[PDB]
């Protein structure tokens, strides 16, 4: 049995790609790459595609549970938010790919116990002005869930205690009267 069965995942996942081509629609630009629901199918996809560090600036990968669009206004994201990891240009080289793989593994591996159900997806943004990785969750007001996810994710990335990462609500980000978005939680 272990000699021939694929190892199912708790959830079915969809990998998306976005190219920020300003001369086309954000509908023609967003793109389902593929869906998978086993560990082996995850690896076959990951091995076939570019590392984030090799994408052109302005591109995203997004891994979301099947049925959740990688867009904050989706029913399952609209009341939620994201644990944001910001990276500088030198971390593109040292940390981006390793942090993104670890993020994928936390999602597909259900690494947040009961609270993995609050996870919607994850996004990596490749940008000239700084790369970003984030885990999106369903409800900002689920304080225990959001906090546990943040604590485990920080530990999995190996970030030291002196580094603070913030959780920002999507609605706050969309409607901020200023430059920076305020946090709902930090870890």
């Amino acid at each position: 049995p272990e000699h021939y069965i694929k190892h199912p995942l708790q959830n079915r996942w969809a990998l998306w790609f976005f190219k920020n081509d300003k001369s086309k629609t954000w509908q023609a630009n967003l793109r389902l790459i593929s869906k998978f629901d086993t560990v082996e199918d995850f690896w076959a996809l990951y091995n076939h595609i570019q590392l984030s560090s090799n994408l052109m600036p302005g591109c995203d990968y997004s891994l979301f549970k099947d049925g959740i669009e990688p867009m904050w206004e989706d029913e399952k994201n609209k009341r939620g938010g994201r644990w944001l990891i910001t990276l500088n240009k030198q971390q593109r080289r040292s940390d981006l790919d390793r942090f993104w793989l670890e993020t994928l593994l936390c999602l597909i591996g259900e690494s947040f116990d009961d609270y993995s159900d609050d996870v919607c997806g994850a996004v990596v943004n490749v940008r000239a002005k700084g790369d970003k990785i984030a885990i999106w969750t369903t409800e900002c007001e689920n304080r225990e869930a959001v906090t546990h996810i943040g604590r485990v994710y920080k530990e999995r990335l190996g970030l030291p205690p002196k580094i603070v990462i913030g959780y920002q609500s999507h609605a706050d980000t969309a409607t901020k009267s200023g430059s920076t978005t305020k946090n709902r939680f930090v870890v």
């Binding site: 190892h7 199912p8 708790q10 560990v39 690896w43 091995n47 597909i108 591996g109 259900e110 690494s111």
Partner: peptide, 14 residues
């Protein structure tokens, strides 16, 4: 229950 895979296992399937 729930299907949980730790990091070591998920790496051994690659």
């Amino acid at each position: 229950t729930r299907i949980i895979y730790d990091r070591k296992f998920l790496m051994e399937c690659r």
